[PDB]
Design a protein around this ligand. Structure first.
Ligand SMILES: Nc1ncnc2c1ncn2[C@@H]1O[C@H](COP(=O)(O)OP(=O)(O)OC[C@H]2O[C@H](O)[C@H](O)[C@@H]2O)[C@@H](O)[C@H]1O
Ligand SMILES: Nc1ncnc2c1ncn2[C@@H]1O[C@H](COP(=O)(O)OP(=O)(O)OC[C@H]2O[C@H](O)[C@H](O)[C@@H]2O)[C@@H](O)[C@H]1O
Ligand SMILES: Nc1ncnc2c1ncn2[C@@H]1O[C@H](COP(=O)(O)OP(=O)(O)OC[C@H]2O[C@H](O)[C@H](O)[C@@H]2O)[C@@H](O)[C@H]1O
Lengths: 399, 400, 390
């Protein structure tokens, strides 16, 4: 269930290790798309089912004329969405050069439908997306505990925690604004909010309140748009819903560059994108510094970039990592049978190393977001220890 | 029924935490109108009960014509005094603007008939208000104990304790004058006492090194303060105050003309002649924005907007600890579970559900009274070997 | 006329004195409603005249039945509307509580008309109010200079400049945003903004870039109190889509205790708390040592600001500079028997025998624009265009 360096580890020692791992100089987390399942989110598996059910006509064309997907994989619902986008874009680009009008519309329809399906699963509240004070609900009660535990475990003279994510939903912002705390994401201004890369080096100070954190979104957001003027703007949720989200969801018009996101395999296709590179540079720079700990939850290991970056970080004798993977036993069994997908071989390789700096936690339902939040400890405000634990010695001498 | 951070803890851990808190850089306390119940005071509910009995026709007119209070709200004892006073003042002002005649005098009578109950309930002793040695009785023992416990625990090179209150009575001055302690109030002189804001930074000093003193802040004025036409604040003794201007209030009727400085109102910013009220709150705000600070609250009912806001906004510091006493706690949770309850019943339950270790809430009914509050305070240890007795700790207890 | 406590000095002495004042520890700038006329602002006189000439049918009722407008002041255009709105709201609340059905609908018309007249003179851009980068226009040019130089004067290790304004229009925010400088106004968040008073003591510092404070005395067009008992804030576009557009382009509709401008709802603690906070912060700043305050665009028509300014003059290190143009006319009016209490208060400061007060009067001598270019002084476009060519 719990492995450290290829061996087996118990529970009490695991808790003691986790407690000691939160006292280092740098602590950070990385949250995937499975972390927001309890708040009302979806998963890429359900997107395929929704697309298949809602659009029964385009699937036939895709499987018949263009041979972009196999029949058995479609029936089993085990197809990769992040890969079909690249093939569809390549097909669209090839046809547009030779002036073939019939194929362009048929591929634009597929792209518009798939993008419409993707965006709808990030609202988390349906039509209630345009209301206010959504952070007071009971669903967003564990994010608040996570933030409180991450920030309360700090000593004066240390650095602030950092949070990395690969989602689009506005759960972290709502949870943080509920408690009245401020997060920094490189934006500033109210009426005209822009992106300034140098706003990541600013911290609070008392002239005569010391509670803040950073937040990096590695794949954009649902409220960021570009006007092609080499600038990026951010607006509120109700403003965005009134502007373009409602039209995209309901009017079923053709998709354009209303909002910038990165669904796909090759992230370098967007040449004029200068945000993605900046965020990944900050991630890589944060990793390299010594005396660092990192907790990973909700990640499916389906990205070449991230799991290629992680592997090279273990040559530093000051980097510790904790990885949660629910369905570990199935992957272990299936790799020995001949092999499986590329996502599972990576996690199997990590488990089998011989360094005492990698820990993998499995166990199905007990390696979820709630359990991960529960494992984090509370600080001890006031540290005799010479007789305090010796009082119970009299009690246990009463056999 | 003791909670911190949403969890629960026992008595021994609570007492150890209380002992730990008392030896910080700064220590303070905040009292309310519930702490004077044991000394002979009364709450606003008794004030309303007396008013409804003593003025039948005024209540009837209010119910029938002016419609300020509904028939169902009054009988079940759920009315409010601050909002009623504010609404009556607004109605009087609009009546004056409309140049009315009967409404003006009727609302003047209504307003003048209300301050009498407050002044009557603020005496704590009755006819013996203008007498000497009032602190020698047995009704002020616990206040003396609290003052002694607060003063004794301090170490050389630290800051003097501070006390805040929202009362009109003199339960603290009588107790402090019996022991010989010299409180600093913000006044000077004997034959003419004036409010100088610059005296809040003065400390005693002996040429050969009495050493015991403390500060007192009254947030809502006092019963012994009157403002002259020269925009000055003067303080007198109890005997002179009783003799000159407060005797006529009880015996006679309709003779209230800004005689004493009190704020029974929900909002005080509309009143634009009071600057001491803004003076005390600056010190209160400055006190709770310093590192290594602790604060105890007892007798407060969370009925003030400004205090609630300033307390809530002060929890963002990482070196602030607070203890709150609130006797009827289970009922508030039960009423909130249905989504209802008053705003006061919601402010307390919101605080209890925080995820920080820097907040503590105590309930239990009769276990969270003023008498029990003083008992939890620890006596200092003088000479401490304390390292060899811990060896004997196991030996001493050998029953079986 | 340019007099310094009753004496006269050349321009060089004035420049040296203002330079010495600008080299103090604490500085502050106070602006009134007269500062907005440089880009499309309006004064009380013009709006009152327009209301008189547009709705004369209900002015007689306001005088005969309610007794709200002084006839002599109305003819002389010497009436305050800010107090009138507050008393109208009080009257409406009293009528609603008393359950007077006939009288309840009467005050809706006057309140709607007053709010329609008020909001027409605060957009400053008309129908283009909901666009972006509106601070880039040439109209908001001297505001950039004022803010930039005020920030530039401050030396390292000292405090930050403060700005007090009575206008309730989005004027300084555009200039601050387009300049590239952050300002703190006691609000935080993006999706749901709330008012936290304790934000006026924060600062920035690079771990390996300054700011300024703004105090809106009477609120703004964006601050509004929703159904919940909390104070919020919205952007210009959202407010325009929500309520600003309707009240200007609708027949008759009134919500009630919803909006928090201009200094209107002071009878509610939830709404009066912010006003009290601004008053307290102003008073606290005024009563600090070695402070210099610059006044401009204020008509001295308030019974509260004048007295609190007068009381603070006890300290020998509190300098006040006033910019009131019509000084010689004031002297001529004072010469005869007739006079006004406001102008008597204004001319009282000229009876001082110490070199701290300096009153500037005349024509262009004391204007909000001219006041801007009195403080001392402290490409990319070509490259941007070259890049934009592709
Ligand atoms: N309740 C739960 N709590 C935690 N983890 C869970 C839970 N339920 C399932 N899981 C695990 O959550 C995981 C679900 O994996 P998926 O979200 O499809 O893969 P990814 O995270 O790489 O996709 C993120 C995409 O978002 C970007 O836009 C890019 O397109 C990324 O590819 C499995 O391990 C489940 O067992
Ligand atoms: N024996 C007791 N010992 C301690 N506390 C007690 C006791 N009995 C009751 N309490 C608590 O004492 C508290 C007071 O009951 P509340 O009805 O809020 O008092 P008020 O209405 O007279 O005015 C209270 C303040 O609110 C106003 O705005 C003014 O600022 C007043 O100062 C409750 O928690 C009681 O349970
Ligand atoms: N270009 C100009 N240059 C100089 N002064 C000017 C200019 N244009 C106008 N003025 C002067 O600007 C002045 C405008 O005076 P008022 O608008 O009454 O002052 P406030 O609103 O700031 O005062 C606030 C109070 O007003 C409310 O009623 C409440 O009582 C508020 O508390 C006149 O003297 C003009 O000559």
């Amino acid at each position: 269930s719990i492995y450290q360096g290829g061996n087996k580890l118990n529970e009490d020692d695991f808790r003691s290790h986790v407690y000691s791992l939160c006292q280092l100089d740098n602590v950070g987390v990385l949250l995937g798309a499975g972390a927001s399942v309890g708040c009302g989110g979806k998963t890429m598996k359900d997107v395929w089912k929704s697309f298949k059910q809602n659009y029964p006509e385009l699937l036939g064309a895709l499987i018949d004329k263009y041979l972009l997907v196999s029949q058995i994989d479609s029936d089993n619902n085990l197809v990769n969405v992040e890969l079909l986008i690249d093939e569809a874009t390549k097909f669209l680009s090839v046809a547009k050069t030779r002036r073939c009008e019939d194929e362009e519309e048929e591929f634009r329809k597929i792209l518009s439908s798939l993008y419409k399906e993707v965006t709808k699963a990030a609202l988390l509240t349906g039509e209630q997306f345009r209301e206010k004070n959504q952070g007071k609900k009971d669903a967003f009660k564990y994010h608040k505990e996570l933030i409180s535990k991450l920030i309360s475990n700090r000593q004066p003279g240390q650095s602030a925690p950092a949070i990395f994510t690969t989602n689009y939903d506005l759960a972290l912002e709502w949870a943080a604004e509920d408690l009245g705390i401020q997060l920094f994401n490189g934006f500033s201004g109210l009426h005209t909010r822009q992106f300034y890369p140098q706003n990541f080096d600013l911290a609070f100070r008392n002239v005569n309140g010391h509670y803040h954190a950073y937040l990096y979104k590695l794949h954009g957001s649902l409220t960021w748009y570009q006007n092609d003027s080499l600038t990026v703007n951010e607006v509120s949720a109700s403003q965005a819903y009134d502007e373009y989200i409602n039209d995209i969801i309901n009017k079923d018009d053709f998709y354009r560059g209303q909002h910038l996101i990165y669904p796909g395999a090759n992230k370098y296709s967007h040449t004029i994108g200068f945000v993605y590179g900046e965020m990944f540079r900050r991630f890589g720079e944060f990793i390299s510094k010594p005396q660092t700990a990192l907790f990973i939850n909700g990640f499916g290991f389906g990205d070449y970039h991230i799991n290629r970056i992680i592997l090279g970080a273990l040559l530093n004798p000051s980097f510790h990592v904790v990885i949660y993977y629910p369905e570990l036993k199935e992957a272990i069994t299936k790799v020995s049978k001949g092999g499986g997908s590329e996502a599972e071989k990576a996690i199997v390789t990590l488990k089998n190393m011989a360094f005492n700096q990698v820990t993998v936690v499995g166990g199905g339902s007990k390696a979820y977001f709630n359990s991960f939040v529960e494992h984090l400890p509370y600080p001890v405000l006031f540290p005799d220890n010479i007789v305090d634990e010796l009082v119970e010695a009299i009690a246990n001498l009463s056999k």
